[PDB]
Amino acid sequence: SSPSSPLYFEGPSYGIRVSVGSNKQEQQVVLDTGSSDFWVVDSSASCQKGNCKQYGTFDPHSSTSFKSLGSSFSIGYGDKSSSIGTWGQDTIYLGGTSITNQRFADVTSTSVNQGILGVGRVETESANPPYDNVPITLKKQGKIKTNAYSLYLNSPGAATGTIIFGGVDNAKYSGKLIEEPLVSDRYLAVNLKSLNYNGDNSNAGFGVVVDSGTTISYLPDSIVNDLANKVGAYLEPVGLGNELYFIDCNANPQGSASFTFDNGAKITVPLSEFVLQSTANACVWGLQSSDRQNVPPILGDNFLRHAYVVFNLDKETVSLAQVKYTSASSVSAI
């Protein structure tokens, strides 16, 4: 069989449930294909913004199997805040299986709200030298045969999505899975050929990270600035000195945007995915500028809900097909 996990829609992202340690301390962490480290919120962490302990915490002192590695973990954000902690190792429970002596960070101060299960490539680890992250360890410990996984975020408003480690549910897409090579030396990124947004076609020709950890999608100014005029998206300040594209919260969400990749792959996304409720009476556009946001171009959850995606970290491919929402299941090993 193939390990698999429900994914719980939270709004900004999807959570995966993982337990840590001899006492199986329960966490819910963001399933993130755009990063590569597993980290948890320490029970004594200092949350810099609000309550960062609503999705579980980890107390290293109560796990008899925990060992600290003593090395620093830190990651910085654009707002110049950070998450800081210490690397350790313990037994982890996920996908119906368990792995021993897995390295992860225990975070003791953070400006975000939740820990993260990074399932990306070893090349995007925040660590030097590289180490075996969760997908690598699942393979090494014989829980999966290939370092690969399939992502089914499911429909907007579905009960859960699913991740399958080492397997593919061939019931959950239409047509054929089309294999794309990676176009980054570090990210799970594929070439975006073109975007037809409700009849307005733009040529692309650049790599996009296929990123489950990101709520919406980020494309270069070369695409978003003209498209914003055709669709009624408009820049407004968001403080302190930043701006985003906004859009009418209440327009008829008629039409779709199609994303064309190489080798004939095409994913169609309803325009409702491009109106996101914000700090309210206001909705942000589901496309934003990767240039302004200072990120690589990204297709996030608003896109991913409409694709079935197989990430193959051994072969260095991402395969895509139009999703088919169904309780039917036929899972095969990758």
Domain boundary among 145, 166, 187: 166
Helix (H, G, I), strand (E, B) or coil at 130: coil
Whether 169 is catalytic is no
Catalytic residue selected from 32, 42, 169, 301: 32
Mention every residue, 6+ apart, whose C-beta is less than 8 A from residue 293: 78, 218
Domain count, the chain: 2
226 is catalytic: no
Annotated catalytic residue, options 37, 42, 211, 301: 211
In the numeric block, the tokens 């995915």 are attached to 273
Structural domain for 323, as ranges: 167-334
Residue burial 53-68, b: 16+ Cβ < 10 Å; e: rest: eebbbbebeebeebee
Residues 321 and 230 in one domain: yes
Where do the H-state alpha helices sit in the chain? 134-140, 221-231, 290-293, 301-304
- The torsion angles phi and psi of 108, rounded to 5 degrees, stand at -105, -10
Q: Which residues contact 63 (CB under 8 A, 6 or more apart)?
A: 20, 21, 22, 23, 25, 90
Give the resolution to one decimal, in Å: 1.2
| Contact by Cβ (8 Å): 320, 309 | yes
Question: Of 166, 201, 236, which residue is a domain's last?
Answer: 166
Task: Give yes or no: residues 14 and 137 share one domain.
Answer: yes
Q: Which CATH number is 104's domain given?
A: 2.40.70.10
